[PDB]
Symmetry: C3
Subunit: 232 residues, 3 copies
């Protein structure tokens, strides 16, 4: 993290000196701080704010969360390495990637939902669907190192589980058909416009083709595709 | 309705004491009010506003609509009950009212549909655009929807100018009821129909009563009532 | 153009008198201007502004682009004719059509991407994805006479090429599967709603890709691809 943070500063410092119309915002958002945690809260606050919710209130809200849970910072960094490897600049991904931003703002919403602040967690969950166009129910359990390519259009149900190092592309739907939502193994690649329905199990290292409609379980390391989807 | 309105005010009261940050907003929107019609209008006007349209201008507009049409109030309650009785995530009445893109969009549409029949079409499209921006629901003002409609995860939905949606229909996210130029060219949905996520239904075809259309399906033919349509291209089951 | 603008000013002066809820906004946007570029620049600036980017700044940016490049003004009028022909009243298409407004904002980002103002280009690119719900990489080459119908949900890759007179619909994905790796769409093609096209494959002139289709192979001119996976018809 400490080095990753060192990158973003240098990388945001270049974009500042070369593009003056983004200089101010880059300073306040990134260059004026001394920690990724503070710089990520400052951003998420300004992005998710509304009449109902001040920007300052949310800056405070995400800052406490990040400073109260070490796993979150461990995730935010892991989700940032996942992009720079799998996908951009480190700083662009910080300030421009809806998939990254929303994943992080979800963990806070997940936290709030565990700490019995459900009315606020659903409110924050509503902003996320409005701004980042990502629709993950707060109760959903997601891992770290998650990549959301062009996250516009994503829907994750209430009782779904997303393992680590999963790549979920645009327009993916993990929904029902109780515990009625899919469980995604570590290192799964889900294709664009894919819909996976019902409490089923996608195996580790598996891959799901674009436009697929998976109803049945998908064994690890296997590739499933089609409408309906069968094992290749 | 007075029960639903009474249930909303109660749940809102519980949330205002459990979370201070949402207190003031819940008061002004729900608690400080005496009816559902006024609380809905107050809320729509705040989510569908811009520099083009003031929040206060819209407040009056929806408020004049609901007060000049009993059917509009009936549709909102019927829609409220249908998210409590039907929705997977099992929402309380207040959370559907405030946080649900679908239900909220549907009530903004009914007014837009009203400004179209009342020959205020340049306004009916201005308000149609806002609904698309904010709620991510693209229904033409000339489209006919019933009441008791469900809209899970609203974002993505598109409904055509000539389409017809009956009562108690469940439309899921990313569904398209669109064409295949002039005339009846969009689908007619019967009552009780469930339309799966992502599914696209094209043309002046009729999805009969109680039928079901699975996710990611591409329906191009008529679907006989009380049956199930599925696949690309969709087949009857 | 000199007429299509004359027709916009006509339709706009009409709605301005038939709905005073929009009267000041129409005057400010359209009727107080003497060019299509200025009104388009004005509008696109208010539609895309945020805390990062002032509306009066983006109004300066769009104005200086259309004024520097005559092929922008043409591509705008082309896109306008296309929607009027294929889909609006001209005024309505100018002010409320997400697909149109996206295109004309994208080309400006594309210019910045060539003129090496790539941080600004991607900034402007990221607003266009918010406001207009169209995700086109500034690197993507698009022609003119382009129609995005209910433009929500469109994703266009970095090495995609979209030819003249193409109709791209609801929920289309022109994506991948470094280097050239995205679709190349010929002139006159109609892409269906929900369709996903993947790879450095070519869609020939005047072809047709059905709705919800998944395209992985090339598609020969003047033929129709359909289904999942897509078969020629
Ligand atoms: C399926 C995928 C994951 C590749 O995995 P894979 O193991 O290499 O799959 P294969 O290349 O072996 O597929 C070969 C067979 O599966 C079929 N197939 C492959 N991808 C398919 C798809 N997306 N939809 C339907 N069928 C598909 C092929 O038609 C072929 O069928 P065949 O056996 O009858 O000849 C990949 O092709 C894909 O779908 N990626 C989506 C990524 C995306 O959408 N990116 C958008 C970026 S903007
Ligand atoms: C289609 C649906 C309505 C089921 O209706 P149904 O009458 O019970 O049909 P069944 O579940 O009994 O399955 C019947 C057949 O159709 C097939 N089938 C069902 N749903 C399918 C789908 N979405 N795609 C492709 N094939 C499907 C089944 O494989 C089965 O095949 P078979 O004849 O070889 O056995 C349901 O599967 C569905 O798709 N719901 C939408 C899910 C959704 O949108 N969730 C989001 C909530 S967050
Ligand atoms: C493919 C399309 C362009 C029609 O073009 P076309 O050249 O006339 O193709 P046809 O109508 O002759 O199709 C006939 C056959 O292709 C099949 N077919 C056509 N369109 C299909 C589609 N979108 N999906 C699956 N199958 C399709 C038909 O079932 C039919 O089957 P058959 O081979 O057994 O006879 C049209 O169907 C389409 O996909 N339009 C999308 C536009 C849209 O989605 N608009 C939304 C507006 S809001």
């Amino acid at each position: 993290e400490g080095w990753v943070w060192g990158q973003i500063k240098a990388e945001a410092r270049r974009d500042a000196e070369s593009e003056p119309a983004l200089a101010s915002y880059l300073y306040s958002t990134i260059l004026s701080h001394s920690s990724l945690e503070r710089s990520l809260s400052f951003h998420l606050g300004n992005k998710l704010c509304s009449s109902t919710l001040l920007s300052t209130l949310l800056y405070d809200l995400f800052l406490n969360a990040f400073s109260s849970d070490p796993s979150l910072r461990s995730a935010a960094v892991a989700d940032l390495r996942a992009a720079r490897e799998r996908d951009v600049s480190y700083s662009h991904c910080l300030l421009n990637y809806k998939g990254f931003l929303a994943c992080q703002a979800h963990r806070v919403a997940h936290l709030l939902w565990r700490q019995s602040r459900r009315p606020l967690a659903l409110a924050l969950h509503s902003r996320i669907a409005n701004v980042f166009a990502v629709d993950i129910h707060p109760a959903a359990r997601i891992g770290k190192g998650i990549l959301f390519d062009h996250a516009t259009g994503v829907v994750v149900g209430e009782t779904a589980v997303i393992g680590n190092n999963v790549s979920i592309l645009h327009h993916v739907t993990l929904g029902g058909t109780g515990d009625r939502h899919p469980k995604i193994g570590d290192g799964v690649l889900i294709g664009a416009g894919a819909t996976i329905l019902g409490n089923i199990k996608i195996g580790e290292g598996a891959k799901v083709g674009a436009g697929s409609v998976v109803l049945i379980d998908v064994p690890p390391r296997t590739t499933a595709v089609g409408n309906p989807a069968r094992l290749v």
